[PDB]
Amino acid sequence: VSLPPLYVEDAVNAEIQQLWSKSPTGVYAFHEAPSVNNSFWPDDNAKFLESIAPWWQSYSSYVNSTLQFLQQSDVNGLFIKRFEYPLNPWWEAVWGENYYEGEIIYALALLGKYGNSQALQMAQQAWLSYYNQLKAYNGATYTSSLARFIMATILLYNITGNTQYSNAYTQLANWLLQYFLDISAMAGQAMMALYAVTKNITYLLDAQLVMNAIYYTYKSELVSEFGDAIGNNTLASLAISRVWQRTSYTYPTSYIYYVARYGSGLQMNSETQPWGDVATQFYVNTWSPSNLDLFWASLPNNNYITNQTWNGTALFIHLYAYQQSQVQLIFLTTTVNFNVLVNGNYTNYEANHQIMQIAPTLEPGPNTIIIIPNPKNQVSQNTNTLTQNELMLLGFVIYFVIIMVTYGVSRNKTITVLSSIVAVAIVYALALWPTYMAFILGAVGFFMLFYSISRR
Amino acid sequence: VSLPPLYVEDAVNAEIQQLWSKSPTGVYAFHEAPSVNNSFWPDDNAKFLESIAPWWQSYSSYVNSTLQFLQQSDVNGLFIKRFEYPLNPWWEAVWGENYYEGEIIYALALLGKYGNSQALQMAQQAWLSYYNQLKAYNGATYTSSLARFIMATILLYNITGNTQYSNAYTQLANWLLQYFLDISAMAGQAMMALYAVTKNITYLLDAQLVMNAIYYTYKSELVSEFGDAIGNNTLASLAISRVWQRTSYTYPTSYIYYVARYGSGLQMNSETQPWGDVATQFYVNTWSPSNLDLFWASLPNNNYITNQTWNGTALFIHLYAYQQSQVQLIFLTTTVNFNVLVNGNYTNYEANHQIMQIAPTLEPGPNTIIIIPNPKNQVSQNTNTLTQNELMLLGFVIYFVIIMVTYGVSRNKTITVLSSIVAVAIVYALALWPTYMAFILGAVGFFMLFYSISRR
Amino acid sequence: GTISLLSTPPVNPPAYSYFYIEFQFLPTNNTPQPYAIFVGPNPNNLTEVAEGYTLSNGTGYARVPVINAQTEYVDIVWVNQNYTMFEIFPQIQNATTTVTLSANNNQGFSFSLPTWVSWVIGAVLMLIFMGVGWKFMGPAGLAIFGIFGLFIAMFFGLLPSYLMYVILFIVAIVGARILTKQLGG
Amino acid sequence: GTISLLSTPPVNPPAYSYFYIEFQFLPTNNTPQPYAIFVGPNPNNLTEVAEGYTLSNGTGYARVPVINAQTEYVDIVWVNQNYTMFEIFPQIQNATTTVTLSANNNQGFSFSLPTWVSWVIGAVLMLIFMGVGWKFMGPAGLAIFGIFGLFIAMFFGLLPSYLMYVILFIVAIVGARILTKQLGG
Amino acid sequence: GTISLLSTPPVNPPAYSYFYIEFQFLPTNNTPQPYAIFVGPNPNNLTEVAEGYTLSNGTGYARVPVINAQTEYVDIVWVNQNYTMFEIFPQIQNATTTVTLSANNNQGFSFSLPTWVSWVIGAVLMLIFMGVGWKFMGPAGLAIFGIFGLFIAMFFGLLPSYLMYVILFIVAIVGARILTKQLGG
Amino acid sequence: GTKIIINVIFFDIILALLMMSFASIQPPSIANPPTVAQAQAQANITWNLTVGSINWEWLWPVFYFVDWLIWIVTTIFAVVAFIFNVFTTSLSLLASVPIVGPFLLMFAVIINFVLIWEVVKLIR
């Protein structure tokens, strides 16, 4: 019965409007890049499923389509990597095992947690297949996929209740203790999940080791998710700000995560857009307060948000910037009136009934933005050839012309009033009349036509 | 008030659709083979009556027809064997006593048990006639017919209450103790019935002797019925699997029992098809659990089912096969979601709201299939020149053509709108329009025709 | 009382389709209650659809269309008591429509006209067909040949489909009348 | 409550025949209750037949037709409370019908046409006969000669029989009207 | 309750006559009750006659006709409760009827035609007389000259007598109408 | 509607006359009105409890009104009986036709069922 929030809806809407086409086999699915147009990655659709799992019932058709795509893209329990369109200058798909397939298991498990029993059964079957495959070797697989496997096992034990999962993750934990930026982020994420489930200190020790250890946007999104798992405001906020530096957002519909600002091919890489959605929604759900939800921030140059704390009844944003300039913050909210404070100058702000937006000018040094919702003695305000007459004359002339021509051709009066109706329609089609007079004359002609038909 | 199940309905529907014609005397009845087309065996119709007895009220017309056929095919109390059509390259029928006429007595008694008092009176009269005929000689009759006579006497004593039957079967028991595969099967079946009625050890001793003693399909069907009577899972399952190796089944309608897979003349021999129906329904009613009813199995080569046990809340099928290959099992059921387990690999399955179907690949050695209905944490999933626009243009042209031609021929408008109606009909007949526009215009033409008739 | 949604409304639906909503009311004692679904772009400009009365259970099943706008607010109203709205982002359909008439399989005549010239062409075609129908059959000929001409327009790239329903409405009432005229005294 | 069948429905009936069903309701206190028989191929696509109210005893006797499909589901519905369906496998009738006109006993002119040419021939014949009837008798001539032409079509291999009932319906209402016009004020 | 006959029905009555039956009901409290007399050959094929309500005493007096069959079952039905039937063997009338037109006393022109030629002759005569009546008088002339022609047919060996009552029914309703049209507003 | 009632009765009488059976409907009866003395005698039940004697003599108007109501109901029932008799006599005359009996009977009983439904509406 839950409804998706605005940021998730915007991101998924943009991806669906731009990154939705026909797979080689028949089920509609997402391709990889706007320019590539050929490869269809089941892992990418798994990422989208992870992004949209909490509000799955909303995008029922798309989730059903991608679930069918995954069903026909699995040999026994392990998914393939690509479904490539042949370059012209019966199955066409490379059969190598798909990287980050543990991400696929995690996505299916997350879908199963909120419903979609088909997704839950899929997750269980693929869990068993990949666990047997791993026990065949030991730890000779992708490490980030292994971390996502531990996460998926934790979720499955949470929602299924089967005891074997427990033992499995313990053994899996050892494998993660047996072992780039993104892999370190996922390893720390799995460390935090393992601590949350078993409360053993060594998992925290490894997680804080990864913490202390700390281009191609996605890596920043995994880093932000890892920092969100840990609980470090500074690292998570910095990573999510690095994520936001190169996104394109408009208020109503679009929320596009570019893959590289400096690179020529910004585009919308499907590997990162669901990752960006997950990072944004995780950051909002964890660190933002109940109502005031910060999901987008345009920070020019290398400006980065450091802290976001809900102190009592007021939100504090501690932010670092370079060479002054202005940043623009957008908060999802319900309240209309509330006062923002940049440093201590009481700047104004813009706020719709669902989105508020501030565009202040920030000093080079660290600066604090204090947003107080529903405040007493509010200070901030809520501020943000021919011509028509010639065309109207031409429209009157055309109307009389067509009416007279119809009466001349056919002596019947019902045909004449019907022609008056269609003349109103025609003169509206050319935009010669305003809609007011056009609609008035159309309704009058309708009723008079029926009266004339009655009176015959 | 009972309703026939799907397997019985399918078998009887196939036999009726294919093996129903006109007898020489006038009453519709079943002939023997698709190719013979001449002989009409009253014994065969008795077999059909045995097959359809538990749900007799469903096929009321056919049962009435075959009962009339039996009535006119009996001289005093003993039925004749054939009603032959003369080969062209007033009664025409060989008058020899019909083999397995005790089967006829058993079929009439079974019909009488569930109703059809005419069938019960018929069974009693033929019982008396054949018992007198046997007491005339002693035991100089067909032995399988004698076993079916003991079965019929048991049923008659069960449903009539006359005491003489009791004494008779005791004497008849001695005759069976005084004495091929099929005859041994019927002898063991009668042994089991005699034990069930009188609980004397010697009948069990003889029945287990027949048990330990153990092409032309029917023999396998009698063997399966005998094993079902005994209670040996292995023998009954093996015989019913041998029965199923050479049957043709589709989901909705057809269920045909061939007479020989290796033989050139597979066809549908009427001597075996009701026997196959009885064997299948007996196996389902006895060994299968309440809901999950296994009635068809496509086993390529010489694969045979060995055991089917309802252990607690899960069904176990122990099966033996050769040279791997895939078998296909079909279960009659009501539940939608339940998980199957071939060996330990958690294979998927197909399930409608009334039929489930599994098509797994089996190892050469013995293998176990575990079906758990309504399970917790379900794993298995439920997955399984001109063109149209040119024709539409031609249809529009034809419609306008016929309307204008009608208006030209007759100046009346009511005839014109009636012709519009018939033009919609014509353009639908040639499939030039989609049914949507055709129906819309037809309804509009109907109402406008009545309006025009009103307005004259 | 309070009103809730028992079924999640599909975000991002097609341009001119419809979806079912499963809306259930709270402290409805035992009686059917009125409702109305105001659907439109921006909460200020709402167009009302889907009148009706919910079941005695307190749950009503309704149909909601999707407008040709980026943002659509759908607001279930109890008509007196509490109400609630949700936002949906339907896929926008381009104003210009390109139609492909397929002839002899592979070859296809593809064309697209500006909305104004298509509208005026369809309007003149409707004039011609309705006049011909009036000459041929009569007042019922108006409706019959209007349906036929609007079908032949929908085959091409011309007047939209929903116009048909207008005529399909107006016929229905007329039909009802004649049926009544053949029943009572 | 619960609903049950007092008479077994005949499995494998002819193609276009009908059979009676004897359906009795449980905890019906003392009043007649509504029912409807949804008959059709596959449980999803059901066509409704046999409206009516059961007797105060709680048992209703209804007529159920058989469709031209291999599998037909017949579903008795109490209209609010519990319902139940059963499946029937009627004999399929071939689309092409072969008709034998017997002349001088042994000799028989046998012919069979494709369904489309038979339908169009019957439609044109109905046009001709209805127009002739309108010219001869009048608006009632339309119905009378429609019945006559449809009879002469049924004699051949042409339009199916049930079309007659349509006309036989439309006449009936008209008759009722005139009777009423000769009774009241 | 139980129903009984207070008067013995006459066995072996003439072919097309009628007889009174005196049927009285048991445990009828104080109210009139419905009844219907199904008369016909064999108990399966009964044709219903003699609607009406019995007196408050519980006794109803009804008229029963006799069919042209060797065995006729007459079944009084209470319409809900108990019923009873009895068999009667009316005298069969030969299909061929011989008519004697007496002229000058002793001499008599006697003739008898097969039922089919008599029926077709009477039908053509009715055509001629009804057409002449329509030409002469009008729509009421249809009924008047139909009565006259059917009288002149009954004088000969032609269409049976009861056909008259049909016309005599249809006139009556018409008469009622005009009377009503001269009474109310 | 009295016009429909009169039309049905006129059709009945015209058809009866056309069968050469001249029989006119007799006037309906009317239930006896309740006299004042009858109501006074009805409400004359006096009873003597240990607390004293009391009589329901002052309840005379209420029982008089109840008597008028039961008179209304009885008159309605008498009219019902008379029209039921008309029904019975009409179709008793109608049922004697040899062959066209059932069909003419169906039409006549439809008309007289309109009559009987008017009676039923009168009852309520």
Added chain:
Amino acid sequence: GTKIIINVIFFDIILALLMMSFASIQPPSIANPPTVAQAQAQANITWNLTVGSINWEWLWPVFYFVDWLIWIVTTIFAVVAFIFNVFTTSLSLLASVPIVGPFLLMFAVIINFVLIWEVVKLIR
């Protein structure tokens, strides 16, 4: 409106006859009227408190009137049952047509729903 009722019944009977199934509607039943002695026996409950004996014999007219009212309601219910039977029989005859079944059924059930709404109005 009795005219609409008669028109619906006439259409029903005409269509039934045209299907070569001659079946006329049977006359509706009427609930038994309450006798005076029944009302007297109803109001014969006498009770004996410590203050004395008293009987509700003088309440005979009130219970007689109540019996007439329940007779009215029972007759209305019987007419309802009869018209429900007419409804059922009409559409039982209508439902046997093979293909045009649903549409003719829709129209016939609309007409007989006009009939049933007349019945419902009669109930109130």
Added chain:
Amino acid sequence: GTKIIINVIFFDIILALLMMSFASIQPPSIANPPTVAQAQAQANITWNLTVGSINWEWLWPVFYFVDWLIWIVTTIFAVVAFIFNVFTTSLSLLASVPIVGPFLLMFAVIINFVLIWEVVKLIR
């Protein structure tokens, strides 16, 4: 007016059929009639004061009549629910048209408000 009711229902069904959605109205339900034994059990409350014992068994006809009245009201409510369902289904079918939705809806809801006002008049 039953004629207006039938006309509205006929327009509803015709429009529904024209949208290629063949759905006929189901017959309305009727509330269960009250049995005599139910009324007898209702009025079986006997109480024992210090002055003696007395039971309201003789009040059986009054409670039977009250049960008939509540049956009438319940049947009226059931008919109301059925017609409300017809209202809802009609405009549920009507509301799916993309652009001409609001205006066709206004006209259809005016017609079905005539229907609902007929229902309200039936209630009173």
Added chain:
Amino acid sequence: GTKIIINVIFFDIILALLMMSFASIQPPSIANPPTVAQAQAQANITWNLTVGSINWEWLWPVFYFVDWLIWIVTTIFAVVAFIFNVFTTSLSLLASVPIVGPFLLMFAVIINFVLIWEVVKLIR
């Protein structure tokens, strides 16, 4: 007369649409029906005189019927409120015309006074 009501509402809606203000009338509300348990709880007042204890539990059907009656009255009042709202909205739309205001208002309020008199007749 429902026809006059529908005509007035149709004129109202047509005029409202012609002023480019598309607003359809909302369905009227219906008062909540009274449950059986509510009536049982209503008639559960038991009192204990020195002569003994007695409860009015057997008076459940009477209070159930009274609850149905008050439901009828409340539904009538709700319909009255809805039609009063229609009245107010119609002339609120009508009153904005600058100069011809009073005369068009007189005619529109005469029509809606026909509407309100229909409502008043419904009340009685």
